[PDB]
Amino acid sequence: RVDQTPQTITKETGESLMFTCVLRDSNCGLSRTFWYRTKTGSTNEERISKGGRYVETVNSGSKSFSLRINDLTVEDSGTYRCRGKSWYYECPYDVYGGGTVVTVNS
Amino acid sequence: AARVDQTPQTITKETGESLMFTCVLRDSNCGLSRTFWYRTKTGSTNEERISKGGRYVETVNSGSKSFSLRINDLTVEDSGTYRCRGKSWYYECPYDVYGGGTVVTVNSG
Amino acid sequence: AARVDQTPQTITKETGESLMFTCVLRDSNCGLSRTFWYRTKTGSTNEERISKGGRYVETVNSGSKSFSLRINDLTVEDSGTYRCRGKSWYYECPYDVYGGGTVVTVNSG
Amino acid sequence: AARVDQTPQTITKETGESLMFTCVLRDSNCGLSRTFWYRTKTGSTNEERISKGGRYVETVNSGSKSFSLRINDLTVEDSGTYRCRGKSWYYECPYDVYGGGTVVTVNS
Amino acid sequence: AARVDQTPQTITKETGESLMFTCVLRDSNCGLSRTFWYRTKTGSTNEERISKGGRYVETVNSGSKSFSLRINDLTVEDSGTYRCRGKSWYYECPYDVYGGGTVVTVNSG
Amino acid sequence: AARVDQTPQTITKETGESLMFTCVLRDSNCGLSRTFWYRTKTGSTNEERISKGGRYVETVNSGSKSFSLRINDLTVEDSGTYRCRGKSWYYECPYDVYGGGTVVTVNSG
């Protein structure tokens, strides 16, 4: 229902990456989009807020939304997953992405 | 408000044995209604809904607000992440919540 | 805006005879689901729901989105106002509408 | 379940004067959100939605869960039945209910 | 050159009774593997997956390449369109076909 | 005793107008870091986080340790309770405090 890409990422400190999720096999369009992060050692995924080095984009035309992270650090390693949900009674949904494992080296 | 505690968070098993996930509805006055389980195999880009039966044993305990998924005769290809889902459309107390997820790694030897 | 066309608006009958109401769901893309009939006796601030039974026969035609109620062996006590109700909780097409009502007067001789 | 008490049930007026309906959301934990008023002219079940302004005056009181419609400079053609509607799609407290209706007769 | 013949095309029943659809894989060298049934309620434009159990009885006869669905204790809310689906990911001969559909109308009295 | 004083306590407005809340961190040596605003619509059972943009304009003044939320083009649906939150995980000065809340009533006419 939503294809998250890429599945694996390996980067060095200071660089940037970008995930992308696309809603497929649905008659509804994008509405509410979220991104989650699970750092190494964490016990509960934490929701990312849009701003500064965390740049989120939404393309309603192509049913795609992206997350860009700049100035990567070793602490940014972990798993990132997207979420798309809508409560529109004519076309409601709530689906998660396959996930992306990120490894930041130095 | 409404929540669901998926456990365990990490699992490592060998081929042929079995494992079991568990989700529990917390911080809500409503009971279980519709329950689902999703899995993302290595190499897949999305979550796929599991169809109960045979090797996939599903149980629901309305009394304790808990539902589980058991997989028997494990295989290396079953590695991946599994997440549960619980939803209800009852107009007096509707909800739609997902589990935290469980990363599964199946080895051999 | 969806409604419900109840007919007839007024009824006058003698004891022992029968009458028939009819309600049709109009201006809606949703179909029939739950249908009910209510009664308000003369001298009351409340409403009592009618139960399907021998002399209280009800029919529903999902194809034409119409449901009717027939009452046999009328009595003077059957006088009052009758109104229908059609509701559905389907989250994709929910509704809850009442009929305009029908005033019934049962005489004798 | 949630309903709506429309008052008054019958109104009879002469040309040129004004009337006022009132609807109140009852038996519900949700508050008012979207409110509308509809009209069915004499001789057909066809319904037209009323637009606020000019001769049509609408008010909403979220505190008391009440909304009203006032029609000024009544005319013989304004006779018919009027019914209100209050709905909300909030998934935590959704509803969509209509009023019992008010039969209006304008004489001269 | 690989489809599925769904029958019957139209069904009309009363409340409380039962019905049965039937799908047969034709013009193919492959046998049945994964079978599903979907439901579209009146007013909606989205497909809903049917779950086995209770009044919903899904059967599969691999010998005759036929799978059926029987619904017991019918209700007015069961009206809508029903269509079947048969898919197999077997790398030697994969397929994924849907049924023509069946329009159901459930009345009362 | 790090706290946060939310003002005003009650607001009454008409449709189309604007309002503004304000929260100030008091009795603490730490400065502002992460600021949020929550909303509880009539019927409650769940707090919703507000996202900056369009009609919701958020401001933060590190100098005066104050952050505000302004809502433009008010609607009857905007009635409810609004409360702020300010938290920081800085190991030298961490905190997590909520606002007292503001009851909003939006009328029309």
Domain harbouring F56, CATH code: 2.60.40.10
Instruction: Provide the chain D residues 83-102 that lie in CB contact (below 8 A) with chain B.
Output: 91-92, 94-95
CA distance D29 to chain B (A): 10
Q: Which residues contact B92 (CB under 8 A, 6 or more apart)?
A: none
Instruction: Report the alpha-carbon distance of residue E101 to residue E37 in Å, rounded.
Output: 10
- The closest alpha carbon to C67, from B22, B77, D83, E106, belongs to E106
Give the whole-angstrom CA distance, residue E80 versus residue E103.
6
- Tell me the residue ranges of DSSP E strands in chain E: 5-7, 10-14, 19-24, 34-41, 48-49, 56-61, 66-71, 80-88, 95-98, 102-107
Cβ of B2 within 8 Å of Cβ of F47? The answer is no
Q: What is the DSSP letter of C9?
A: S
Nearest CA in chain D to B94: D92
* Structural tokens at position E71: 């619904």
Q: Do residues E31 and E47 lie in contact, with contact meaning Cβ atoms separated by under 8 Å?
A: no
Q: Which domain holds residue C38?
A: 3-107
Instruction: Quickly count: other Cβ atoms within 10 Å of residue A98's Cβ.
Output: 23
CA distance D96 to B25: 29
Which residues have a Cβ under 8 Å from the Cβ of C58 and sit 6 or more positions away? C35, C37, C52, C67, C68, C69, C70, E108, E109
Angle of CA points B43, E37, B85, to nearest 5°: 50
Indicate if the alpha-carbon torsion angle D42, D48, D51, D57 is positive or negative.
positive
d(CA E7, CA D43): 46
What values do phi and psi take at F46, rounded to 5?
Answer: -175, 125
Is residue E62 classed as helix, strand or coil in its secondary structure? coil
Number of separate domains in chain C: 1
Q: How far is D93 from chain B (nearest CA, A)?
A: 7
Distance of CA E16 to the CA centre of its chain: 20
Buried b (16+ CB within 10 A) or exposed e, B14-42: eeeeebebbbbbeebebebbebbbbbbee
CA distance B92 to B28: 12
Query: Beta strand D56-61 with D66-71: parallel, antiparallel or unpaired?
Result: antiparallel
Element (H, E) at F86: strand F80-88
Which residues are E13's β-sheet partners? E106
What value does the CA radius of gyration of chain F take, rounded to a whole number of Å?
Answer: 14
Asked, as a colleague might, if the bond just before A6 is cis with ω within 30 of 0, I would say yes
**Which residues, listed in sequence order, are joined to residue C58 by a DSSP beta bridge?**
C69
Q: Measuring CA to CA, which residue among D101, D95, D85, D97 is closest to residue D35?
A: D85
Please give the method by which this entry was determined: X-ray
With beta carbons under 8 A apart, name residues in chain D contacting F47: none
Give the containing element (helix H, strand E) for F103.
strand F102-107
Cβ pairs A/E, distance under 8 A: 5
Q: Given CB atoms, is C49 within the 8 Å cutoff of chain A?
A: no
C20: buried, middle or exposed (CB in 10 Å: 19+, 13-18, 0-12)?
Answer: middle
**Helix, strand, or coil here: D63?**
coil
Partner residues linked to E20 by β-bridges = E70
Three-state secondary-structure class, residue F105: strand
C-alpha span between F33 and F25 (Å, rounded): 11
A63, burial (CB in 10 Å: exposed 0-12, middle 13-18, buried 19+): middle
- Which two structure tokens, joined as six digits, stand for B7? 């456990």
Tell me how far CA of residue E89 lies from CA of A86, B46, E68, E94, in angstroms: 31, 17, 21, 5
Which of C22, C62, C68, C89 has its CA nearest to residue E74? Answer: C62
Q: Residue A101 corresponds to which amino acid? A: V
